[PDB]
Amino acid sequence: QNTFLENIVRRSNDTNFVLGNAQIVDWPIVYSNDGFCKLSGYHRAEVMQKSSACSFMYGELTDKDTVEKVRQTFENYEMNSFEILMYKKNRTPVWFFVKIAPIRNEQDKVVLFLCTFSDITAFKQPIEDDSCKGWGKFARLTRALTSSRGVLQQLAPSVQKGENVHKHSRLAEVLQLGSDILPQYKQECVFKTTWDWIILILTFYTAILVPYNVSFKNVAWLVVDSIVDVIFLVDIVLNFHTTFPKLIRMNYLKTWFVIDLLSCLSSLKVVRLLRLGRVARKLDHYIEYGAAVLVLLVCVFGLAAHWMACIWYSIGDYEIFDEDTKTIRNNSWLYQLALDIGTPYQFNKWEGGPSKNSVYISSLYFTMTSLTSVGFGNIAPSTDIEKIFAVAIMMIGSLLYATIFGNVTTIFQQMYANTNRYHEMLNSVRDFLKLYQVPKGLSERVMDYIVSTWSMSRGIDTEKVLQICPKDMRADICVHLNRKVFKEHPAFRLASDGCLRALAMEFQTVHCAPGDLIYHAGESVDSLCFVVSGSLEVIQDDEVVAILGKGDVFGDVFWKEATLAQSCANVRALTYCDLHVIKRDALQKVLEFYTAFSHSFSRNLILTYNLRKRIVFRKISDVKREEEERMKRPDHPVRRLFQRFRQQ
Amino acid sequence: QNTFLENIVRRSNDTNFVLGNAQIVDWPIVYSNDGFCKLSGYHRAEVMQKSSACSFMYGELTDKDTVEKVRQTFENYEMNSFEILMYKKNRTPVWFFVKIAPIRNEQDKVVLFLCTFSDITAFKQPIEDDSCKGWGKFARLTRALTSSRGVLQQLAPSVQKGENVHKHSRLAEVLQLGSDILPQYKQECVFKTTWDWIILILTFYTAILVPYNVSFKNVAWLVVDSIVDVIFLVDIVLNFHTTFPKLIRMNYLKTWFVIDLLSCLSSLKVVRLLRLGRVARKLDHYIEYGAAVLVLLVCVFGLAAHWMACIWYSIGDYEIFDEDTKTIRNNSWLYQLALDIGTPYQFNKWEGGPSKNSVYISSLYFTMTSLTSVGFGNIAPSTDIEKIFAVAIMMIGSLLYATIFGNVTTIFQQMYANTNRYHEMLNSVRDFLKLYQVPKGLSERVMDYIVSTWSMSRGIDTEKVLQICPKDMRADICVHLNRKVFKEHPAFRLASDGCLRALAMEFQTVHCAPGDLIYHAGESVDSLCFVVSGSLEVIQDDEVVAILGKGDVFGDVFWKEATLAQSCANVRALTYCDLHVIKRDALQKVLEFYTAFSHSFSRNLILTYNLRKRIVFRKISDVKREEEERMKRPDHPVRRLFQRFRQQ
């Protein structure tokens, strides 16, 4: 987007300016702000289309040497600055400081001119053609140079030598504005995706490995642990730096920085469990995707399984040796587990029982039985704190199983509604056709039409899709849709592009099935048709009169006739035909609007077949009958009727 | 579909041709391609409706003997070929090679003629009526025969005797084109279903029997196994051959052939598990059907049960004797199973325990407890690898149970939405009628109307179904719907079929409940009605004036009157009445368009009851009162009003 005006008016700070066209003779004004309207005393429409030299603002005391200096700076495309007595709408002699900056382009062309203004009346000299008094003209000069003296020469009324300080500072403000004349009238991440992916898999790593290291407590795991720490710190500084600079840093310190700092800095290793705060960055990224939330629920299901498995082992380990009496108590899932798999605990000391890998996967098996509502009961809780933990994990497993089932059911509901609406409309059409006892050929024809247009369109109301778009986008879409007419016919290559869009907005598109007829003989012809694909036959009295191929126009010339006629012939299709039709009313609307186009349209459009003009012909069977009639070789009430035919 | 033009233009290869009507006198042209338009120098509309003898193309030097030869070949319907000097639009003497082929039919009738052309100017002789020079006319002859000499006589400029080689080859190309004149202007599997069914049940067989033969390891099973192999190979060659010949074979080798070849060719019997790649052929075939996907999920549920049951037995068998120390380890579901059912393992050697049928069905019971989330725990895992397998199968069973529950819920949601929309609109209608305190008779009448039209229509917006169809199909559907008028009335049997469709598109259809009145006395009559079923009464002043049966027309004649009138009588229905009404505006539109029909319509349509013309009558109670009035046996302000009635 090109915010060429907004940057100038933001930098300007109550100073005023006009914009003129640098590439047009006499340099006409294309824009003037309200400050220039107030200082000039003119209105926007009255300012624009005048010269940006502001020759209408000149006067008898306006120096012509400054005028040709302005002309030279406009011709040479040169940043300059001048002061000149110019007049207003009330013809007051007002000295102006015009600063002219050419405007380059992305193509570096000198396309515009910027002329900024101020009032230098009080700064130089008061000169009046007539005034009430010297104080009155002086007061008018001070009131005119109000925003010059006021909001720029603030402390300058205390000091002397304002021409040496404050006027030079206003000229330097115009110089910094010329430094800000850079917008030049032109329009002015995958690393984040890959970074969020690798920190997501590392958050899965730490959510597996931290409760593992809490409960069950090499070297290369410590190496990759330090890699996890430094990559997390790089992610913190990237969450500082990257887009949504200092305002997003303050927003990050408000939002998430305390958790993300304490997450990755000896019991406080459980504080590392808060590293899943990074996962909420990706959770919004794939909540729109639906089938991946099933994968999200399965992943958090396994993650919570690993979590509460380590919690379950922690409960067993807290329970076996909770006292200094060192009793096994004959009651724990660890003790029943050691009696189950073998090697019960022994003492010589207290020699441990089961191996830690078997312990972890046995505990994960137990937590999976809990969260999956299976519940075998090999490992099954019998101590107090493990039982209240069992209640807790069963209440969590119910909700996790519910969320999985609801997500799967919603996935199936979308995947089934998208086909069920089509199957239901097909079933209702079959029900309707069976209701009214359509002859089976026509029922099959309408049915295979419905299946064919549902295979082609895939269930898209394309006209409604065009209603979703705005006006110009829909018109340009229609122009691309009717490129198959407009690039092909000589009738349309002389049209204006506005006429192209105002035509293309009226063109329906027909997908004719083979064997299906468009205009039956006797139907109203009200829409000339262009054939962009397929092959057509024209049947007059059971006889093929015209074969229409690609790029042919039939129907009836409306703009010459202005008369509705009957189709003198059937028009049937031979192949899958693509037609681009236009009714006569919209055609006549466009042709009445585009008057200079319509004559060239009449001269260029040659109908391949008039569907009004019945063509006279005889069959060869008829002249065979006439040749047979050599073997054969009152009229007064009827021949007068033939004389009425003579009167006809 | 009849692609009569497309085959000719595909075979033609830059040669040009016209198509003329063989059954019409003077043999008029029905088609000419752009090559003929370029060679002739004429436009498509200017070519067509001229003779296919191209008599307009003839000249002073055109041989009349060739003209009558062309006439004889057209009359006798004979494939021939000629060369003749003919003229163009700029009247240039151009020698043509016309090749004429009659076009047969599916009915073998000589319906069209094909006349193909080329330029034989340079090949025979240059003859000009006038030219600039001999080289100029020679250059025009070479430029005219450009596509003849260029893209056909390619290497012939190197050789001599072009009349003996290249011109004969172009005539032979026309001969092969006459061999390709076969399209003749005419339109040009259950074994796959049964084959996919029997390979589907065989894929169920191999998916049951291969893990059975992997884990648990007669003769007739080997016989039917070899039948499975040979039927699978026949399916491979049918997937090569059958529709979607060589392109589908290359697409099959890209798509599925490697898997389907390695699937059916001693440990690589597990490779036979990939035979389920055939099932993806049927999975797309019944994904549209919805209730069968429940059967699909139950079948893959039992199939995965059998799979992981064999995997479970494999885990037990791998676990009992994993070492050469030959320890039972007192820990396996096989060992606990043998201690459960009886016969523990013994040695004398190692005598086995449980019987293999009991082992398989016990393992299948266990896998069903896992996948059904029941989890009794007779068989319940206690070794390491069986526990991580238990985690795996519980994570699979959760998703399988979720998919089953989601599919069942979607099935119930479709089966319930289809009745819930009707029950909800009925509840809202009852709520609305109870809201405004309708007298209970009228509420019951509207309610039983709604239930009656929902029993009859079964919830089908039949007008919207007509909007789904295209124009001609909707018109033909409407013609079949109003066959009950058009086959019955003498008013419509003189109509054009275009008038039939343009009328039938305007006919509403009313299902009058008995006791319900159409036109109340005083309502506007604007729609003449045809009664195709039922019985009606016409009430004027509480007295039945006309009983209307099947095939009667009431309303008002609009086209004579062109005046809107009031209904002078109530028109009530006696039975379930089927009416086909048409408003006066669409009727007047059609009758204004079909002018020659409207007179016969006026002559033939006799109204069974004018609803405008009030009929004068007296009641017998009134004349009984008048006979009573014999016992009974100022006017000037009122009788003058009666004189005003005389003025009326």
Numbering used by the authors:
A (entry chain C), B (entry chain A): 14 to 201, 214 to 242, 247 to 273, 284 to 304, 324 to 406, 412 to 696, 706 to 720
Provide the authors' own sentences about this structure as they appear in the paper:
Voltage-gated potassium channels (Kvs) conduct potassium ions in response to changes in membrane voltage. Kvs 10–12 have three intracellular domains: an N-terminal Per-ARNT-Sim domain (PAS), a C-terminal C-linker domain, and a C-terminal cyclic nucleotide binding homology domain (CNBHD). In addition to voltage-dependent gating, Eag1 is also gated by the calcium sensor calmodulin (CaM). CaM binds to Eag1 only in the presence of calcium and holds the pore closed even during membrane depolarization.
In the presence of Ca2+/CaM, Eag1 Δ3–13 remains open at hyperpolarized voltages. Two different conformations were identified for Eag1 Δ3–13/CaM: conformation 1 at 3.7 Å and conformation 2 at 4.0 Å resolution. In both conformations, the S4 helices adopt a depolarized conformation and intracellular domains are rotated in a counterclockwise direction when viewed from the extracellular side of the membrane, but in conformation two the extent of the rotation is larger (2.4° degrees for conformation 1 and 8.6° degrees for conformation 2). The rotation observed in these conformations is in a similar direction as the intracellular domains in the open conformation structure of hErg. However, the extent of the rotation of the Eag1 intracellular domains is not as large as the 20° rotation observed in hErg and the S6 helices remain closed. A hypothesis for why the pore remains closed in the structure of Eag1 Δ3–13/CaM is that, compared to hErg, Eag1 might be more stable in a closed conformation. Rotation of the intracellular domains observed in the different conformations of Eag1 Δ3–13/CaM occurs with CaM bound to the channel in the same orientation as observed in the WT structure.
